[PDB]
């Protein structure tokens, strides 16, 4: 089949400081013991998991970056350790730690060694939302395997299981200040912040289809229409280009918003600054598939 040539408007960006945080990813990897074998860490090699984070937070500092590239190594490793006796019993051990619970495992313990740094000395509005996110993310592989679709259901879950929001509730940590709780759940923001999710999801199910697995846009598709493969990867084409002009339309759509509020200047700009971000991600993921 023939994979689409996607456009994205959205000017390239990476973080430069790649080399340097890659190199504290591994050295935190190695401490936790995340990766405990050879085959475990080909795994990791292979999917180029350190150099998507310099896609995601391509204007974050050093620090930052490094925090982030825990995240993406954890979460991977959480993955690649994945009927619903035995998915709810795990996820609910991941997700207690989340809130302060005591573990009786490494990837455990790992995850709440992370969110002990990452949370400290944070705005509580902060952690609450990125929390909800990663638990929502968490939680999709509960229900993924109860399931074993409807398309309407899978793209409303399909944004979380991406990861994208909890990984833009990571790019605040770089921000001049926390954007204002008006700003991040506002209208457009929420917008914005689902439609570049499905886009990037999308995107990732056509480039992912041939490796996969049934929970995949384009396998839903081919199986509910009967159509070809082909037709289907037309289809969700369809389905990404429709994200993109939803996209589009909230970035303005913000401004206007933005502007209604009348926030101070400093927090104005900050929101500008975010939605960019999660602009670029959308050209970002594109080149990065590129390797």
Same mark, same amino acid.
């Given at each position: 089949f023939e994979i689409p040539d996607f456009y994205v408007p959205f000017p390239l960006e990476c973080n430069p400081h790649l080399e340097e945080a890659s190199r504290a990813m591994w050295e935190w990897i190695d401490a936790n013991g995340l990766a405990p074998t050879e085959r475990a860490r080909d795994r990791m090699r292979r999917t180029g998991a350190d150099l998507s984070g310099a896609y995601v937070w391509p204007?974050?500092?050093?620090?930052?970056?490094?925090?982030?590239?825990?995240?993406?190594?954890?979460?991977?490793?959480?993955?690649?350790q994945i009927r619903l006796p035995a998915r709810m019993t795990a996820i609910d051990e991941l997700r207690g730690t989340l809130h302060g619970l005591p573990v009786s495992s490494p990837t455990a313990r790992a995850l709440g060694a992370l969110w002990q740094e990452t949370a400290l000395g944070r705005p509580a509005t902060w952690c609450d939302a990125f929390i909800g996110h990663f638990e929502a993310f968490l939680q999709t592989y509960t229900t993924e395997a109860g399931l074993n679709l409807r398309l309407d259901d899978y793209?409303?879950?399909?944004?979380? !299981?991406?990861?994208?929001?909890?990984?833009?509730?990571?790019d605040e940590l770089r921000l001049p200040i926390f954007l204002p709780g008006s700003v991040r759940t506002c209208g457009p923001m929420n917008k914005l912040r689902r439609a570049g999710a499905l886009h990037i999801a999308l995107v990732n199910d056509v480039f992912s289809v041939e490796r996969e697995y049934q929970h995949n846009a384009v396998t839903i598709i081919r199986e509910?229409?009967?159509? !070809?493969?082909?037709?289907?990867?037309?289809?969700?084409?369809?389905?990404?280009?429709?994200?993109?002009?939803?996209?589009?339309?909230?970035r303005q759509e913000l401004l206007e918003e933005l502007d209604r509020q009348a926030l101070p200047s400093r927090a104005r700009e900050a929101a500008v600054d975010y939605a960019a971000n999660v602009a670029a991600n959308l050209s970002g993921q594109l080149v990065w598939h590129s390797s």
């Open positions: 204007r974050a500092d050093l620090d930052t970056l490094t925090i982030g590239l825990k995240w993406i190594a954890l979460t991977f490793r959480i993955d690649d793209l409303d879950r399909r944004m979380y !299981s991406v990861g994208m929001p909890w990984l833009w509730d990571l509910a229409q009967g159509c !070809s493969l082909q037709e289907a990867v037309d289809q969700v084409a369809v389905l990404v280009e429709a994200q993109l002009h939803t996209v589009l339309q909230a």
